From a paper:
Aggrecan (ACAN) is a large, secreted chondroitin sulfate proteoglycan that includes three globular regions named G1, G2, G3, and is decorated with multiple glycosaminoglycan attachments between its G2 and G3 domains. The N-terminal G1 region interacts with the glycosaminoglycan hyaluronan (HA), which is an essential component of the vertebrate extracellular matrix. ACAN is a large, secreted glycoprotein that spans more than 2500 amino acids in humans. Its N-terminus includes a globular region named G1 that shares ∼39% amino acid identity with HAPLN1 and is composed of an immunoglobulin (Ig) domain and two Link modules. We demonstrate that the single immunoglobulin domain and the two Link modules that comprise the G1 region form a single structural unit, and that HA is clamped inside a groove that spans the length of the tandem Link domains.
Thus, the G1 domain of ACAN was crystallized in the presence of a fivefold molar excess of a HA decasaccharide (HA10) to obtain atomic level information between ACAN and HA. The crystal structure of the ACAN(G1)-HA10 complex was solved by molecular replacement and refined to 2.59 Å (Rwork/Rfree = 0.194/0.238). There are two molecules of ACAN in the asymmetric unit that superimpose with an RMSD of 0.18 Å over 301 shared Cα positions. The electron density for the bound HA10 is well-defined for all the sugar residues in the oligosaccharide. The oligosaccharide buries 820 Å2 of surface area and fits within a groove that spans both Link domains in ACAN, while the Ig domain does not make any contact with HA. Comparison of the bound and free form of ACAN indicates that the segment comprising residues 217 to 241 that was disordered in HA-free ACAN is now ordered and makes substantial contact with the oligosaccharide. Concomitantly, HA10 adopts an almost linear conformation that differs from the structure of free HA obtained from powdered diffraction. However, a loop extends from Link-2 to bind to HA between the two Link domains, giving the appearance that the oligosaccharide is pinched at the interface between Link-1 and Link-2. Overall, the 10 monosaccharide residues in the crystallized HA oligosaccharide contact 18 amino acids in ACAN through van der Waals or hydrogen bonding interactions. Surprisingly, there are only two salt bridge interactions between HA and ACAN residues in spite of the five negative charges found in HA. These interactions involve the guanidinium groups of R217 and R326, which contact the carboxylate groups of GlucA4 and GlucA6 at the center of the bound decasaccharide.
Numbering used by the authors: 30 to 54, 70 to 350
């Protein structure tokens, strides 16, 4: 008689802490998560002891077990996008066993943003407006830490909502060592004066509409792309909306204009000729050091948003 007294699905933000109450009426508690075609066992508990999946140590626990033997409440800390899925609370008592499920959707995505004024040109105030102009708000360290645990690697320092300047690193290297040297993790410069200029990390929570490509035989200049999205009853998508679209699996091997006068394209399948065997939002720059948005007269597709 296992029950989870919560409506499904449950939608929570990236970087927060989750609590799934599970009650039931010597028993063996087993928590699992079903995401795509895979299933992961989070923890197993019996006789007052909790064995936790090695990769989820300190992240998941039973805060009320075994102090209350019939309370299998699960707590998940530092919610990532890969912590989304169908959570199963399973209890066994001898040959008997029942279960309850709850689908959890972790909303949001963190992305690095280099502005049209180019590298390290955003002070704390302009770092905040760049996110607002891209369907997002400046990210918190908790959100950046969660994105790093999802594999985010970016060797560009950027402002954060707590007036710190950080960047996440998985593969330490000359130029990306920071304060942490060869150990992986999110580097930090500490709290910085607001007049200092860096990039920024933005957190896009959600979007109501859909992102789609609009093209033509001879492509579009930036202003022609803006008119084409308008003609179709839409508008140019922002960088934040493209990242959310990519997160939902959008793939298009063609660069296109965005509302911030940038040129990007999403890649969800790693091919050599499309994205260079990399996944994510690829940005086209003028100079090889990833500086300078393309000239507005350059011809690209239009990335629209309903
Ligand atoms: C105050 C005080 O004092 N403070 C303190 C501190 O101190 C500090 O510290 C700091 C630290 O931090 O440490 C420092 O800083 C530093 O400093 C130094 C000195 O000065 C510096 O240096 C640094 O900086 C850095 O550096 C670095 C280096 O350099 O290294 C850098 O790095 C970078 O990073 C980044 C980020 O992560 C990255 O990204 C990079 O990398 C790169 O990248 C690039 C890019 O991205 O771009 C790349 O490239 C690329 O790649 C890709 C991939 O692979 C590719 O893809 C590409 O290519 C392309 O591709 C494409 C595709 O898509 O694929 C193509 O296209 C195509 O094509 C094809 C053929 O044609 C076609 O097919 C297609 O299409 C298709 O088809 C077609 C036909 O066919 O027809 C058509 C249609 O269309 C379709 O269908 C196409 N596609 C399309 C779509 O269209 C193309 O072609 C190609 O091109 C690529 N690109 C290229 C251009 O190539 C690469 O790879 C890579 O590499 C990196 N880099 C490198 C070099 O590596 C960074 O960034 C930076 O940052 C600094 N740092 C920082 C962070 O800042 C300072 O100094 C001091 O003061 C301390 O520390 C502490 C403790 O003690 O404390 C405090 O308080
Ligand atoms: C997190 O989920 C994204 C979704 O595409 C996936 O690409 C990435 O590999 C996942 N990371 C981890 C560490 O599971
Ligand atoms: C910010 O202001 C301080 C104090 O006025 C000044 O010394 C410093 O050069 C400025 N920083 C930058 C990055 O311009
Ligand atoms: C990037 O390369 C271009 C072209 O050589 C150069 O003008 C520029 O100074 C370089 N660095 C930065 C930080 O823009």
């Amino acid at each position: 008689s296992v029950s989870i007294p919560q409506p499904s699905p449950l939608r929570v933000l990236l970087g927060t802490s989750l609590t799934i109450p599970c009650y039931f009426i010597a028993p063996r508690i087993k928590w699992s998560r079903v995401s795509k075609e895979k299933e992961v066992v989070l923890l197993v508990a019996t006789e007052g002891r909790v064995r936790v999946n090695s990769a989820y140590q300190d992240k998941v626990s039973l805060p009320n077990y075994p102090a209350i033997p019939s309370d299998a409440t699960l707590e998940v800390q530092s919610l990532r996008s890969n912590d989304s899925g169908v959570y199963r609370c399973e209890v066994m008592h001898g040959i008997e066993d029942s279960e309850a499920t709850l689908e959890v959707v972790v909303k949001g995505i963190v992305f690095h943003y280099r502005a049209i004024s180019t590298r390290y040109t955003l002070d704390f105030d302009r770092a905040q407006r760049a996110c607002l102009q891209n369907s997002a708000i400046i990210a918190t360290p908790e959100q950046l830490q969660a994105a790093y645990e999802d594999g985010f690697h970016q060797c560009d320092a950027g402002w954060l909502a707590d007036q710190t300047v950080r960047y996440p690193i998985h593969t330490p290297r000359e130029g990306c060592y920071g304060d942490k040297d060869e150990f992986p993790g999110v580097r930090t410069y500490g709290i910085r004066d607001t007049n200092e200029t860096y990039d920024v990390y933005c957190f896009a929570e959600e979007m109501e509409g859909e992102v789609f490509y609009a093209t033509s035989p001879e492509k579009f200049t930036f202003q022609e792309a803006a008119n084409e999205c308008r003609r179709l009853g839409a508008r140019l998508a922002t960088t934040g909306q493209l990242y959310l679209a990519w997160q939902a699996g959008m793939d298009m091997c063609s660069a296109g204009w965005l509302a911030d006068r940038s040129v990007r394209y999403p890649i969800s399948k790693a091919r050599p000729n499309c994205g260079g065997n990399l996944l994510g939002v690829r940005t086209v720059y003028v100079h090889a050091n990833q500086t300078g948005y393309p000239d507005p007269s350059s011809r690209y597709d239009a990335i629209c948003y309903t």
